[PDB]
Amino acid sequence: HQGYSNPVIPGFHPDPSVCKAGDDYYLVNSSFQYFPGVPLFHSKDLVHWEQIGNCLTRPSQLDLTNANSGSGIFAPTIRYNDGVFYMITTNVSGKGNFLVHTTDPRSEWSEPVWLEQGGIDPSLYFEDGKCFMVSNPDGYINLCEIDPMTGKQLSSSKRIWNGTGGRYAEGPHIYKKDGWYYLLISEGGTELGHKVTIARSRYIDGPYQGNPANPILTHANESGQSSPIQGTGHADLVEGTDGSWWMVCLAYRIMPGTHHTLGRETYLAPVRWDKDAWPVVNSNGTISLKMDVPTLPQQEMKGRPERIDFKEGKLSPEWIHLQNPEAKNYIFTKDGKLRLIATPVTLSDWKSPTFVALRQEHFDMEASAPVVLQKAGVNDEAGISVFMEFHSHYDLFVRQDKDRKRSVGLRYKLGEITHYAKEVSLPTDGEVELVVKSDINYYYFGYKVNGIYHDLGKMNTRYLSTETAGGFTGVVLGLYITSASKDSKAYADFEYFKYKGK
Ligand SMILES: OC[C@@H]1NC[C@H](O)[C@H]1O
């Protein structure tokens, strides 16, 4: 009933959108180049969320050909109307705006319904048995009516608002309250200028008048300059079960030199919204890591195990691949291990490697996995990658050398630099566990064999940040295998993956 910590969904979880279905809440984030796409969460209190799935789970729903951290799936919106859930988003590397739908969030969602109106950040609003679509073609928020089952546009597109004048007017959502249509948007860009603004009109098609108190949420001003949270925006308003009001939004946690490696994460703010008043977010349009505020009655949910095993023969919804995966290269062994089949595709090829990953969700964490490389030719490797983009990743691996010898290697890829930090000979026998630790300043790398941990050294976090590397994503920690020999049939078994955040 009182108190929570932000972010409510840590790590790479941007552009949150939320809907209420009775006493259940469902939330979606953008996923860019990763498959499956559009993680789907469930909560009873808005504070604790369980990843129950992903909306885009089949290749036919999600073409990721040549997708990267600056493309693929952009902001999604989720809405619930008359027993049907709708997830509407843009595939920027593919065919653009579309939705998928289902009567059961945990099931396989529909095939894509492709939509006519352009721009990005498509969103839906329902009234009087009609479905209204907004999006932002040419930097104008445009409104139309659609049949959401067929994708047919039923009225012409009308321009309605283009914000208060801030850059990149986007993330439009319509709500109706107290006889007003409210249009909530983001301005200022998704970096340090991010801000939430709002306007209203008696008519859905305008004219919209901006809140004299805009912006309603931002850390861009003097009031936010000292905050460890920055870039607050891309919000979605939602009603509490007790009649209170809330917004979910994106933001990020800054690091020395103005860097962020954990991506844009999902945050929660209380909203005062009296009858016939404009909404006010958390008194002064800011948020904090510790939120000492009343809440809906709190119910804890299932989270990431500290030791994930592969005995059930299914990866959880949290695991993600690069672009569309070669599904045959991920298999489960008789004795319940994850088996990755090698291909020659490296982590710098801008194509899908045999690679499967979990989002890093804490500044301070330790991740590890045992690695059993088998049937390997010389230079074949398997291990863990701290991965931001195809040109920006740190690789820790067991490599097959000549004469049945092996070694542990540590390779940093940063644009034109491919830097071998360490190459250390392994003992002929002994199961190797690879270990990656971090704090806000460094990644630390090591390996454990025969009960002894060896330090391989450290590398700066900043070179993998969004500010350095570009794109719209966060660091993921990936298990991978790459072959680099004649006709290799190499594979590697991973018995578990350990992750613990401080
Ligand atoms: O986070 C990806 C895009 N950034 C701005 C826009 O609102 C989003 O779709």
Residue numbers in the entry: 20 to 521
Task: Show passages lifted from the paper.
In this context, we recently reported the characterization of a novel xyloglucan utilization locus (XyGUL) that confers Bacteroides ovatus, and species harbouring syntenic XyGULs, with the ability to utilize this abundant vegetable polysaccharide across sampled human populations. Here, we present the three-dimensional structures of BoGH31, BoGH43A, BoGH43B and BoGH3B, expanding our knowledge of the structural determinants required for xyloglucan degradation. Our analyses highlight key adaptations in these enzymes that confer their specificity for xyloglucan oligosaccharides, while also providing a rationale for the maintenance of two divergent genes coding for GH3 enzymes, and similarly two divergent genes for GH43 family members, within the same PUL. While we were unable to determine a structure for BoGH3A, our structural and sequence analysis of BoGH3B has also allowed us to highlight further potential differences between these two enzymes encoded by the operon. Together with existing biochemical data, our analyses of the three-dimensional structures, and various enzyme-inhibitor complexes, of BoGH31, BoGH43A, BoGH43B and BoGH3B provide molecular-level insight into the stepwise breakdown of xyloglucan by the BoXyGUL.
There are two GH43 family members represented in the B. ovatus xyloglucan PUL: BoGH43A and BoGH43B. Both enzymes have demonstrable activity on l-Araf-α-PNP, though BoGH43A was considerably more active, and both are thought to be responsible for the removal of pendant arabinofuranoside side chains from solanaceous xyloglucan substrates, thereby converting S to X for further processing by the α-xylosidase and other members of the PUL. Crystals of BoGH43A in complex with AraDNJ and AraLOG were obtained by soaking native crystals in 10 mM (final) solutions of respective compounds supplemented with mother liquor for 60 min, prior to cryocooling. Soaking of native BoGH43A with two putative inhibitors, AraDNJ and AraLOG, yielded respective enzyme–ligand complexes, confirming this as the active site. AraDNJ was able to displace TRIS from the −1 sub-site and appeared bound in a low-energy 3E conformation typical of iminosugar ‘furanose’ inhibitors. The side-chain carboxylate of Asp140 (O3 and O4 positions), the backbone amino group of Ala94 (O4) and the OD2 atom of Asp34 all directly coordinated the inhibitor. GH43 members typically contain three highly conserved acidic residues in their active sites to impart activity. Together with Asp34 as the general base, which activates water to attack the anomeric carbon, Glu189 is ideally poised as the general acid, while Asp140 completes the triplet of residues and is important for modulating the pKa and orienting the general acid for catalysis. AraDNJ binds to BoGH43A with Kd = 35 ± 4 µM, while AraLOG binding was too weak to be measured using this technique, consistent with its inability to displace TRIS during crystal soaking.
